[PDB]
Scaffold this active site. Structure first.
Site, mmCIF file in Angstrom:
data_model
loop_
_atom_site.group_PDB
_atom_site.id
_atom_site.type_symbol
_atom_site.label_atom_id
_atom_site.label_comp_id
_atom_site.label_asym_id
_atom_site.label_seq_id
_atom_site.Cartn_x
_atom_site.Cartn_y
_atom_site.Cartn_z
ATOM 1 N N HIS A 40 0.808 -1.242 0.000
ATOM 2 C CA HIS A 40 0.000 0.000 0.000
ATOM 3 C C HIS A 40 0.837 1.287 0.000
ATOM 4 C CE1 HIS A 40 0.146 0.296 4.602
ATOM 5 N NE2 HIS A 40 0.071 1.564 4.270
ATOM 6 N N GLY A 175 2.809 6.828 8.758
ATOM 7 C CA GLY A 175 4.217 7.225 8.471
ATOM 8 C C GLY A 175 5.141 6.053 8.784
ATOM 9 N N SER A 177 4.097 2.907 8.217
ATOM 10 C CA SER A 177 3.723 1.876 7.195
ATOM 11 C C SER A 177 4.905 1.431 6.372
ATOM 12 C CB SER A 177 2.689 2.431 6.198
ATOM 13 O OG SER A 177 1.456 2.358 6.893
ATOM 14 N N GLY A 178 5.001 0.144 6.144
ATOM 15 C CA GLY A 178 6.096 -0.434 5.353
ATOM 16 C C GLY A 178 7.341 -0.801 6.127
HETATM 17 C C1 LIG Z 1 0.916 3.396 7.619
HETATM 18 O O1 LIG Z 1 1.609 4.260 8.136
HETATM 19 C C2 LIG Z 1 -0.642 3.370 7.724
HETATM 20 C C3 LIG Z 1 -1.155 3.099 9.174
HETATM 21 C C4 LIG Z 1 -0.341 1.987 9.857
HETATM 22 C C5 LIG Z 1 -1.045 1.447 11.141
HETATM 23 C C6 LIG Z 1 -1.196 2.545 12.191
HETATM 24 C C7 LIG Z 1 -1.761 1.955 13.527
HETATM 25 N N1 LIG Z 1 -0.869 0.875 14.077
HETATM 26 C C8 LIG Z 1 -0.736 -0.196 13.039
HETATM 27 C C9 LIG Z 1 -0.137 0.357 11.721
#
Ligand SMILES: *C(=O)CCCC1CCNCC1
Ligand SMILES: [Ca+2]
Length: 223
Positions: A40, A175, A177-178
């Site tokens: 994503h 932020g 994510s990944g």
């Molecule tokens: C990426 O940054 C989208 C949101 C990620 C989720 C935020 C809440 N904790 C698990 C990961």
């Protein structure tokens, strides 16, 4: 990362920042020419930034390399986030040493209760946005499948696992994510999704990397 601490410069040598004129996602270096992140996080024009600590200042040790290609898992589903994993090949190989190093892929999956390290430059507030300059860290345990499914009924596939705290206050956030979820020195998860950040009874959900080791190996071997 909410409720975390400052990692310390270059103490997480496999952490990378995916940049398109600003930091938008994290990733993990698994060999000198490949990074693993979340599907994503895909977009074109990605510059991979290695050896970073403060992402707004060049402090030394940074290596900025453009991505040659990004490979989103063929069965990635943007609605369920099942198979939320992507491989990024770098235009040139990174120089590895102590400040920039790759993380190993697992040989077996991890069990509930294993303590892991989650890191990233994502939001540090659950209610509003505050983005840090330096890398933050959080130690979190993998939860049991029953607690995970009780928290997100009907949304957890076998390619996901929950990690975190049901009491709230500590979690990965936008932020992050990944980015990596490392347990006992192996990359076991990728920050994928959750409901809000650090809310009670809503742990974070991560892509279960042990289910993709053969896919990663086979894809790298043919590209
Ligand atoms: C990426 O940054 C989208 C949101 C990620 C989720 C935020 C809440 N904790 C698990 C990961
Ligand atoms: Ca920097």
């Amino acid at each position: 990362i909410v409720g975390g601490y400052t990692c310390g410069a270059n103490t997480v040598p496999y952490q990378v920042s995916l940049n398109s004129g600003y930091h938008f996602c994290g990733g993990s270096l698994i060999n000198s020419q490949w990074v693993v992140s979340a599907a994503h996080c895909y977009k074109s024009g990605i510059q991979v930034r290695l050896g970073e600590d403060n992402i707004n200042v060049v402090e030394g040790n940074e290596q900025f390399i453009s991505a040659s290609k990004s490979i989103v898992h063929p069965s990635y589903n943007s609605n369920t986030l099942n198979n939320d994993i992507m491989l990024i090949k770098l235009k040139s190989a990174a120089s590895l040493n102590s400040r920039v190093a790759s993380i190993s892929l697992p040989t077996s999956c991890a069990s509930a209760g294993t303590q892991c390290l989650i890191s990233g430059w994502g939001n540090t507030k659950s209610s509003g946005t505050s983005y840090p300059d330096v890398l933050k860290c959080l130690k979190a345990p993998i939860l049991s499948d029953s607690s995970c499914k009780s928290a997100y009924p009907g949304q957890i596939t076998s390619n996901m696992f929950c990690a975190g705290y049901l009491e709230g206050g500590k979690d990965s956030c936008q932020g992050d994510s990944g980015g990596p979820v490392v347990c006992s020195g192996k990359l076991q998860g990728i920050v994928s999704w959750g409901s809000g950040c650090a809310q009670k009874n809503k742990p974070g959900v991560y892509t279960k990397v042990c289910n993709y080791v053969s896919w990663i190996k086979q894809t790298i071997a043919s590209n």
